[PDB]
C-alpha cells in the first residue's frame, strides 16, 4: 500500500502487500527507519496493532496515516 508513519514531527513512507501480516510491517520499518524489533508499537484507527494480524485484516488504506511509538 501507500502508508505514512507519523509521530508529530517524522514520517517514513512504506509499501507493503495488504495480505501481509503486521509482523512484516514492523520489520518493513526496523531496517528502513532505525528502531529495533520489539521497540515498535503501532497505533491505527483507535486500535493497537498485533504482530500476527494482517495489514489488510485491519483494512488500512492507500494515502493513509498510521502512528508509531518508541517503546522503552
Amino acid at each position: 500500500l501507500n502508508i505514512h508513519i507519523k509521530s508529530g514531527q517524522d514520517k517514513w513512507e512504506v509499501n507493503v502487500a495488504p495480505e501481509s501480516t503486521v509482523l512484516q510491517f514492523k520489520e518493513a520499518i526496523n531496517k528502513a527507519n532505525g528502531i529495533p524489533v520489539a521497540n515498535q508499537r503501532l497505533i491505527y484507527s483507535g486500535k493497537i496493532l498485533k504482530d500476527d494480524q494482517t495489514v489488510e485484516s485491519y483494512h488500512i488504506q492507500d494515502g493513509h496515516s498510521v502512528h508509531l511509538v518508541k517503546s522503552q
Binding site: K6, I43, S45, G46, K47, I48, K70, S71, Q72
Partner: protein, 953 residues
C-alpha cells in the same frame, strides 16, 4: 445544511476548529494541510483526535480531555434524541464514541502515546473524581476485553495505582476518605467484569518479590494498600483519638461508632473485591491462597514476646485479611454443619503446599514423628488443595499470627503507657543549664511525648476495633465452627456433631506416661499445629474483657465449651499444659457469677450440654492433679488450681447434677477422688505461709525503696526491685487466693460428705493442716501483717478463718476426726479456738452465736479426748510405744524394719503376715521375708528396758 450541522457538532464535542479564529476556548488545528479543509465530518475525526493527543499543544491532561469528549458526546446524544432530526447526526456520535473509547484504551496501555502526562497523572485525575470517569472507564474496559488486551490495560492501571498510593499521597489510609473510597470504586469497577476477575492475579506485582520485606507486603503488592485500610492504623488513631485523649466515655463512644461504621463498609468492599477474584477461575482463587499464605508465613514474629514491628506487616493489614478469611469460611461452618465434611481432616497428612509448618509445635507430637508420618502418608504428587480446606486452615493461621498479634499488642499497652509517663516525669525534673544539653533534653521529652500520644491513640483505636461486636462475632462464630470441626477430627467415627462423641477415648489411667499418652494420641489430630488451639483460646481469653464481647450470650458458644472439655477430659489430645491452663482459665471466666449474682455465662451450657455435663467434673478433678508434673511459668499449677476451684465451687452451688457427680465420685471412685483431695490438702500446708512470706518480701522491698539516705542494704537495680516487687505481689495474690478457694472447697464438701475426709490417708494430714492454718490465723503470723489494701492480694484472713473453722464444725461428729485433732501435739491447743472465736466476733455477722457455740462444743470434745488419752497413757501406758508391735500391741522380741514402709515390727508378726500375704502390711508393697532388716539397736533398748523392770517389781 446538515453536513454543516454535523461539522459543528464535532467542533463543540472535541473543542477544536480549523480556520477558525474566534468565539469559544477551542484550540486551532496546527498546521496540517490536509486537515485544513473547511468542510469537516465523520472521517476527519480520527485526525482531529490524533492531532489532539500526539501533535499535542498545551493539551496537558489528555485523558481528562478524552473523558470530557465522551461526556460531551453523551450529552449531545440526549439533546438530539428529542429534536427535529436526530437521525442525520447518528453517524457522527457513533464515530466520536468509537474513537474516544479506542484512544482511551490506547492512552491506558502504552506510555508514550501522548507527550503530555503519563499513567500516574491520568490515574491521579481518575482517583480525584472517579464518578466522572466511571461510564468512560467502563467502556474502555469492555473495549479492551473485546480486543484481547485486558491484561495490558490492567498492567497500566493497577501498578500505577500502587505508585499513586505510596508516592503521591503522604499516607494511603482511612484518613484520606475521598481517595480511598475512589480507589475502592476503581477495583470494584474493573473486577466486576468477569474476564478481568479471571486474570487479575497475573498483574505485574500481584505477588511480593522474593526480596520484599514483610512490612512492604501492604506497600509493594497490588492488593496491599487497600487491604491495609483500617482504623487501627497509627495515623488514623492519632487523628481520631490523639486529637483529644481526655474525652468522656460518651464522647469516645461516638468515635468508636463512626470508625466501626466505616470499617464495616471497608470490609464489605474488600470482601466483594476478593470474592470476585476467588470466583474468577481456579488460577485466581489458587493465587489468593498463595498470596495470603506468603504474608502469613513471613509474619510469625508477630507473636514473639518482643516483635520487631517495623519488620512485620501491620495490625490493620493482618486483621483485615483475618476477617476476609473468616468470611470465606463462614458458609461451610453454618450451624447445620451440613458441609463440615468439605474440610479435609487429612490436610496435614501430607507435606503442606502453602502454609509453612517448619518450626510449628504440634498438639501431641514432635518434628521427627510428623516428618515420619509424611513418609508413610504424603498423597501422590498432584493430589492437592481443596480451596475450602486451604481457606479454613489459613483462617486459623491468621487468627493466631494476625489477630493474635494484634491483641497482644493492645494488651501490653497499659504498661507501656505507665512506664512512659514515669520516664517523662523524671526527664521533666532535669535542670539543664547548658544550651546544647537543654536542646537535647527537650528533644528527648518531645520524642517520648510523641511515642506516648501514639500509644494512647492506638490503644483507643484497638479498643474500638475489638469492641466492634458485629465484626468480632464473625471471628467467634468461626471459632465455634472450628471447634465442632476439631471435635470431628478427634471422633474415631468422624461422625460428630451428627453423632455424639464418646469420652474418654482411651480408658482412664490409674509416673511419666507422656510417651504412653503420645503413643495412643489420636491420628491425625496429634499432628495438627498448636496454633489451631492457641489462636482460639488467646482470642477468647482476651476478647472476654470487652463488655460487648461476642462470646457473651452467643448460642454457638457451646461448641467451643464442648471442645475445651474434651481437651481437658482426654490428656492425650494436647500435651502442652500452658495451653490447657489457658483453657481452664477460660472456663473459669464463664463460671464467675455476674455482678448481679446471676450464674456465669457458661453455667447454662455446663448444665444442659450432654457432652459437657458427662465430662467436665471428672476433667477438672483429673486436671487438678496432673498439672503437678512440671506445670517458673505463669499459667502455673497454682493458677490452674485457682481457676479449677472457681468452677468447682460454682458448679456445686448452682447445679444439682454436679453436686451429685461430686458426691458420687467420692463414694464410688474414692481413689480418684482422694488423689484430688490429698493434693488440695498438701498445697494447703504451705500456701498461706507462701502468701505471708511474699507479703513480707513486699515490705522489705518497699522499705529499701524508702531509704533515701540509702545503705544500700543491696538495692541492686531500682528497676530490678520494681520487678521483684511486682513479682512478690503476684505470688502473694495467687497463694492467698488459692488458699481461700481451697479452704472454701473443704468447707462445702465436708458439709455433705464428711466421711470422705476421715479415712486414714487424709484424716491425720488434715488435722495437722487445719491446726497449722489455725495457728497462723489466730496468731502473729497473720496478726503482725499489715499491708495497705490487702484485698488487692486476695488476703482475707477473716474469711479464711471463718471457712477453716467451718470445716472443724462439719467434721465434728466424725470420731476419727475428733481423735486425730486430739492427738496432733504439734498444733492442738483448746485456746486457738478461743482466740478464733475472739477474732471472728470482730467482723459483726461473720459468725452467728449458734456457730460459735458449735465451735466451742467441738473444741471441748477434742480437749476432752486429749485428757482421756493422757490419763490412759499415765495409768496404763507402762511400755514405751516404740517398743510395741504395731499389729500385736505387745513388746517385740526381735524387731525388724520393713524396707518399703520403714515400720518396725516383730520378726514373728511379719512372718505370720507373709505366710498368707506376700506384701508389706502397711503399704501393700511386694515383700519377701528375707528383705527384712534386723533392728539390733532397738532390740537392745527393749532388753535393757526389760532388765530395769525385772530387777525391782
Amino acid at each position: 445544511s446538515p453536513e454543516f450541522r454535523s461539522m459543528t457538532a464535532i467542533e463543540d464535542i472535541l473543542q477544536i476548529t480549523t480556520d477558525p479564529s474566534d468565539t469559544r476556548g477551542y484550540s486551532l488545528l496546527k498546521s496540517e494541510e490536509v486537515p485544513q479543509g473547511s468542510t469537516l465530518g465523520v472521517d476527519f475525526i480520527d485526525t482531529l483526535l490524533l492531532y489532539q493527543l500526539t501533535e499535542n499543544e498545551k493539551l496537558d491532561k489528555p485523558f481528562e480531555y478524552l473523558n470530557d469528549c465522551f461526556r460531551r458526546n453523551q450529552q449531545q446524544k440526549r439533546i438530539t434524541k428529542n429534536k427535529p432530526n436526530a437521525e442525520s447526526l447518528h453517524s457522527t456520535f457513533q464515530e466520536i464514541d468509537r474513537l474516544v473509547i479506542g484512544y482511551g484504551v490506547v492512552a491506558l496501555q502504552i506510555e508514550n502515546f501522548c507527550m503530555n502526562g503519563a499513567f500516574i497523572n491520568y490515574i491521579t485525575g481518575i482517583v480525584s473524581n472517579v464518578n466522572s470517569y466511571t461510564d468512560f472507564l467502563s467502556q474502555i474496559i469492555q473495549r479492551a476485553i473485546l480486543e484481547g488486551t485486558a491484561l495490558d490495560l490492567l498492567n497500566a492501571v493497577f501498578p500505577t495505582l500502587l505508585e499513586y498510593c505510596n508516592k503521591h499521597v503522604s499516607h494511603f489510609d482511612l484518613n484520606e476518605s475521598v481517595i480511598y473510597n475512589n480507589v475502592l470504586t476503581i477495583f470494584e469497577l474493573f473486577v466486576t467484569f468477569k474476564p478481568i476477575a479471571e486474570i487479575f492475579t497475573k498483574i505485574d506485582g500481584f505477588f511480593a518479590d522474593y526480596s520484599c520485606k514483610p512490612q512492604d507486603f501492604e506497600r509493594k503488592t497490588i492488593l496491599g494498600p487497600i487491604l491495609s485500610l483500617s482504623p487501627i492504623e497509627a495515623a488514623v488513631a492519632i487523628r481520631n483519638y490523639g486529637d483529644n485523649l481526655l474525652r468522656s466515655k460518651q464522647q469516645t463512644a461516638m468515635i468508636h461508632e463512626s470508625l466501626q461504621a466505616e470499617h464495616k463498609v471497608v470490609i464489605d468492599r474488600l470482601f466483594f473485591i476478593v470474592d470476585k477474584l476467588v470466583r474468577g477461575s481456579l488460577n485466581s482463587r489458587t493465587d489468593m491462597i498463595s498470596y495470603f499464605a506468603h504474608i502469613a508465613n513471613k509474619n510469625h514474629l508477630r507473636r514473639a514476646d518482643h516483635p520487631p514491628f517495623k519488620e512485620l506487616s501491620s495490625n490493620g493489614f493482618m486483621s483485615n485479611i483475618t476477617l476476609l478469611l473468616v468470611r470465606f469460611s463462614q458458609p461451610f461452618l453454618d450451624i447445620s454443619y451440613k458441609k463440615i465434611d468439605k474440610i479435609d481432616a487429612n490436610y496435614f497428612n501430607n507435606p503442606s503446599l502453602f502454609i509453612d509448618l517448619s518450626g510449628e509445635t504440634r498438639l501431641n507430637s514432635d518434628f521427627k514423628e510428623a516428618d515420619a508420618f509424611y513418609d508413610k502418608n504424603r498423597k501422590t504428587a498432584d493430589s492437592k488443595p481443596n480451596f475450602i480446606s486451604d481457606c479454613f486452615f489459613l483462617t486459623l493461621t491468621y487468627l493466631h499470627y494476625g489477630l493474635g498479634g494484634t491483641l497482644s499488642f493492645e494488651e501490653k499497652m497499659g504498661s507501656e503507657i505507665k512506664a512512659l509517663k514515669e520516664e517523662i516525669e523524671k526527664v521533666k525534673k532535669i535542670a539543664a543549664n547548658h544550651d546544647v544539653f537543654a536542646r537535647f533534653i527537650t528533644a528527648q521529652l518531645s520524642k517520648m511525648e510523641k511515642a506516648l500520644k501514639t500509644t494512647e491513640s492506638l490503644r483507643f483505636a484497638l479498643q474500638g476495633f475489638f469492641a466492634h461486636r458485629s465484626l468480632q462475632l464473625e471471628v467467634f462464630d468461626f471459632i465455634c465452627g472450628a471447634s465442632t470441626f476439631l471435635i470431628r477430627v478427634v471422633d474415631p467415627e468422624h461422625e460428630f456433631p451428627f453423632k455424639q462423641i464418646k469420652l474418654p477415648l482411651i480408658p482412664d489411667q490409674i509416673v511419666d506416661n507422656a510417651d504412653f499418652l503420645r503413643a495412643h494420641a489420636p491420628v491425625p489430630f496429634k499432628y495438627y499445629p498448636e496454633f489451631v488451639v492457641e489462636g482460639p483460646v488467646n482470642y477468647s481469653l482476651y476478647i472476654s474483657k470487652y463488655q460487648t464481647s461476642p462470646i457473651f450470650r452467643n448460642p454457638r458458644l457451646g461448641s467451643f465449651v464442648e471442645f475445651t472439655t474434651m481437651v481437658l477430659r482426654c490428656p492425650e489430645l494436647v500435651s502442652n499444659p500452658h495451653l490447657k491452663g489457658k483453657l481452664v482459665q477460660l472456663l473459669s471466666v464463664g463460671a464467675m457469677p455476674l455482678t448481679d449474682n446471676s450464674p456465669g455465662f457458661m453455667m447454662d451450657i455446663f448444665e444442659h450440654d450432654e457432652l459437657v455435663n458427662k465430662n467436665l467434673l471428672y476433667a477438672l478433678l483429673d486436671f487438678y492433679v496432673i498439672v503437678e508434673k512440671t506445670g517458673s511459668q505463669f499459667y502455673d499449677k497454682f493458677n490452674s488450681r485457682y481457676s479449677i476451684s472457681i468452677i468447682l465451687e460454682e458448679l456445686y452451688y448452682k447445679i444439682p447434677s454436679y453436686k451429685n457427680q461430686l458426691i458420687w465420685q467420692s463414694q464410688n471412685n474414692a481413689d480418684f477422688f482422694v488423689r484430688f483431695v490429698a493434693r488440695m490438702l498438701n498445697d494447703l500446708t504451705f500456701l498461706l505461709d507462701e502468701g505471708l512470706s511474699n507479703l513480707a518480701e513486699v515490705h522489705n522491698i518497699q522499705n529499701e525503696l524508702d531509704n533515701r539516705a540509702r545503705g544500700a542494704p543491696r538495692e541492686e537495680e531500682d528497676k530490678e526491685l520494681q520487678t521483684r516487687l511486682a513479682s512478690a505481689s503476684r505470688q502473694a495474690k495467687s497463694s492467698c487466693g488459692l488458699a481461700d478457694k481451697s479452704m472454701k472447697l473443704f468447707e462445702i464438701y465436708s458439709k455433705d460428705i464428711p466421711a470422705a475426709f476421715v479415712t486414714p490417708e487424709i484424716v491425720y494430714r488434715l488435722a495437722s493442716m487445719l491446726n497449722y492454718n489455725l495457728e497462723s490465723l489466730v496468731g502473729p503470723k497473720c496478726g503482725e501483717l499489715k499491708v495497705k489494701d490487702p484485698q488487692s492480694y486476695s488476703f482475707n484472713p477473716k474469711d479464711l478463718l471463718k471457712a477453716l473453722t467451718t470445716v472443724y464444725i462439719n467434721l465434728s461428729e466424725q470420731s476419727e476426726f475428733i481423735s486425730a485433732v486430739a492427738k496432733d501435739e504439734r498444733s492442738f491447743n483448746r485456746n486457738l479456738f478461743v482466740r478464733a472465736v475472739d477474732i471472728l466476733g470482730r467482723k459483726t455477722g461473720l459468725a452467728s452465736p449458734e456457730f460459735i457455740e458449735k465451735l466451742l462444743n467441738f473444741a471441748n470434745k477434742a480437749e476432752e479426748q486429749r485428757k482421756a488419752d493422757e490419763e490412759e497413757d499415765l495409768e496404763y501406758g507402762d511400755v514405751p510405744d516404740e517398743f510395741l508391735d504395731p499389729l500385736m500391741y505387745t513388746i517385740m522380741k526381735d524387731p525388724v524394719i520393713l524396707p518399703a514402709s520403714k515400720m518396725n515390727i516383730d520378726r514373728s508378726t511379719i512372718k505370720a503376715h507373709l505366710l498368707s500375704d506376700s506384701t508389706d502390711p502397711f503399704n501393700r508393697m511386694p515383700l519377701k521375708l528375707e528383705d527384712v532388716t534386723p533392728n539390733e539397736e532397738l532390740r537392745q533398748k527393749i532388753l535393757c528396758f526389760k532388765k530395769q523392770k525385772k530387777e525391782e517389781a
